[PDB]
C-alpha cells in the first residue's frame, strides 16, 4: 500500500530521499497518481512551505503531506518516524496555523465542494486545465466541458473559475455572466479553498460580470 513523490527539493535533497525510500522497501515516482500516499515538501525553520501543484493534489487527494524534515530526521534516527509528528500546516500565502491536510486526511466523504459544479473556463498558466479540473474533481465538484453544458436548476450551486491575467486577447473575460448564470471566480477561489480545506465562501474573489 506504500508510495509517494517529492516537491520543492534539490538533487542532493532528492538523494537522502532516495536513500530513505530505497531503504524502507518503497516506491518513488516523479509525478502524481491516485496511488501516491505521500508528498514530501521543502520547508524552512519549521513546517511552513510553498504552493506547488503537487501540493494541492496531496490535500485534494487528502493524502499524507509530510514535510521534508520527516527524512533528514528518519535518517538522523536510523528508523522511519511518525507522519503526524512532521506534517505540513502552512505556506507563503495561506498561513502558519491552518493544518490543511488534516481535515483532508480526516474529513473524507464530507468533502468541501459538496455537490458543486465547477467550470474552469480557460485559459490558465503553470497548470494544465486537466490538472486543475482533476483537482476539483478530487475535492468533489464535477467538471463541466463548456458553460452552456451546465446542469442548472434543481439542487446544485454552479460556479465559473477563470484565471485572471492569463487571458490573451482579453476582457473576453468580462462577458461571461453575459454568457450564463453562475458565479465567476478567480483561480484563487479554488486554490485557497483546497489548501486551507475551508470551502471558502466565495464572497471575496468574484470577478465582476456584466449585466
Amino acid at each position: 500500500r506504500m508510495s509517494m513523490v517529492v516537491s520543492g527539493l534539490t538533487p542532493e535533497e532528492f538523494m537522502l530521499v532516495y536513500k530513505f525510500a530505497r531503504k524502507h522497501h518503497i516506491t518513488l515516482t516523479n509525478l502524481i497518481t491516485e496511488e501516491t500516499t505521500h508528498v514530501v515538501m521543502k520547508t524552512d525553520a519549521e513546517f511552513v512551505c510553498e504552493r506547488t501543484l503537487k501540493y494541492f493534489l496531496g490535500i485534494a487527494g487528502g493524502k499524507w503531506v509530510v514535510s521534508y524534515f520527516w527524512v533528514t530526521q528518519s535518517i538522523k534516527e536510523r528508523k522511519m518516524l511518525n507522519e503526524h509528528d512532521f506534517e505540513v500546516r502552512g505556506d507563503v500565502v495561506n498561513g502558519r496555523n491552518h493544518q490543511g491536510p488534516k481535515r483532508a486526511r480526516e474529513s473524507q466523504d464530507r468533502k468541501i465542494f459538496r455537490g458543486l459544479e465547477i467550470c474552469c473556463y480557460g485559459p490558465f498558466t503553470n497548470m494544465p486545465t486537466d490538472q486543475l479540473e482533476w483537482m476539483v474533481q478530487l475535492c468533489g465538484a464535477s467538471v463541466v466541458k463548456e458553460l452552456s453544458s451546465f446542469t442548472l436548476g434543481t439542487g446544485v450551486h454552479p460556479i465559473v473559475v477563470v484565471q485572471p491575467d492569463a487571458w490573451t486577447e482579453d476582457n473576453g473575460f468580462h462577458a461571461i455572466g453575459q454568457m450564463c448564470e453562475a458565479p465567476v471566480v478567480t483561480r484563487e477561489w479554488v486554490l485557497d479553498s483546497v489548501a486551507l480545506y475551508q470551502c471558502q465562501e466565495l464572497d471575496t474573489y468574484l470577478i465582476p460580470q456584466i449585466p
Binding site: 534539490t10 521543502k42 506547488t52 503553470n126
Partner: peptide, 11 residues
C-alpha cells in the same frame, strides 16, 4: 509569473 512550484539556490 513569479512563478510557482520547483526551484533552487538563495531561497
Amino acid at each position: 509569473g513569479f512563478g510557482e512550484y520547483s526551484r533552487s539556490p538563495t531561497f
